[PDB]
């Protein structure tokens, strides 16, 4: 399949060179395989939904996404229009308050439910969590996205925003797990991604185009804006049997586009995700 005049980083994840404008991908479209974006909530309403998305857990007195970021996170992952994985299923957890902040301890909290949670839903490809949200290194916060990912849930954290080695960041620094920095449409690190060995892939975090609340878009820039790409690319692929929730970052990072990107600091990886789409 193709859409054309797509927002620059779908194009871009299914393409081995910058600059075209058409995403390529199986027409699947992760159908069968889930997401759970953990951040300020979903519109669910949205049209670009499609009756796909709905909230499953709140720790505040409204499930309903007063913020917008969480509603653009979700729309990278699984809108008709701006999403990578079109027809998948999209699951809200809101751990942050309607100005973007947790407490680590709810942030703790949302990922033992995800674990738990899936469970409770069908989602025969498989199940991804998406967590566009960091702070200063904690232990407990690393050990819950460890096991997040553990029990069967691939997960992708965003490597964070303030252009310094994401190992003083967490959950960004656990090994294990996928952390996702951002790049630009000319295929720069953007500007404030943070970088470092912990970091396993890039994706375009740079003027990313999403749906936002009271009905609307909006083009926004961080790392945050990177790691749904890749949590949809995640989806798709675990559609078409190419990978497990287990290996899903392995297979990203091996099947990568490689050398591409440029003001990468030596010691971080220099791979850019990729759809490996042959129509
Ligand atoms: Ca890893």
């Not at 997401?35 to 007195?61: C, L, N, W």
């Not at 809108?79 to 957890?93: D, E, I, N, P, W």
Request: glycine content about 12%; charged content about 15%; hydrophobic content about 30%.
């Amino acid at each position: 399949a193709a859409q054309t005049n797509a927002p620059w980083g779908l194009a871009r994840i299914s393409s081995t060179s910058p600059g075209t404008s058409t995403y390529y991908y199986d027409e699947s479209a992760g159908q069968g395989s889930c997401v759970y974006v953990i951040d300020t909530g979903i519109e669910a309403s949205h049209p670009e939904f499609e009756g796909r998305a709905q909230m499953v857990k709140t720790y505040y007195y409204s499930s309903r996404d007063g913020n917008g970021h969480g509603t653009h996170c979700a729309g990278t992952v699984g809108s008709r229009t701006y999403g990578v994985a079109k027809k998948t299923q999209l699951f809200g957890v809101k751990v942050l308050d309607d100005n973007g902040s947790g407490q680590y301890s709810t942030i703790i909290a949302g990922m033992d439910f995800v674990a738990s949670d899936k469970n409770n839903r069908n989602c025969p490809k498989g199940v991804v969590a998406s967590l566009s949200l960091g702070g200063g290194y904690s232990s407990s916060v690393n050990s819950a996205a460890a096991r997040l990912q553990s029990s069967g849930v691939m997960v992708a954290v965003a490597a964070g925003n303030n252009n310094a080695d994401a190992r003083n960041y967490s959950p960004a620094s656990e090994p294990s797990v996928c952390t996702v920095g951002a790049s630009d449409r000319y295929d720069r690190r953007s500007s404030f991604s943070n970088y470092g060995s912990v970091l396993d892939i890039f994706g375009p975090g740079t003027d990313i185009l999403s749906t936002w609340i009271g009905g609307s878009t909006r083009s926004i820039s961080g790392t945050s804006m990177a790691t749904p790409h890749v949590a949809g690319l995640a989806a798709y692929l675990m559609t078409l049997g190419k990978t497990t929730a287990a290996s899903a970052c392995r297979y990203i990072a091996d099947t990568a586009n490689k050398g591409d990107l440029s003001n990468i600091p030596f010691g971080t990886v220099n791979l850019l995700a990729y759809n490996n789409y042959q129509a």
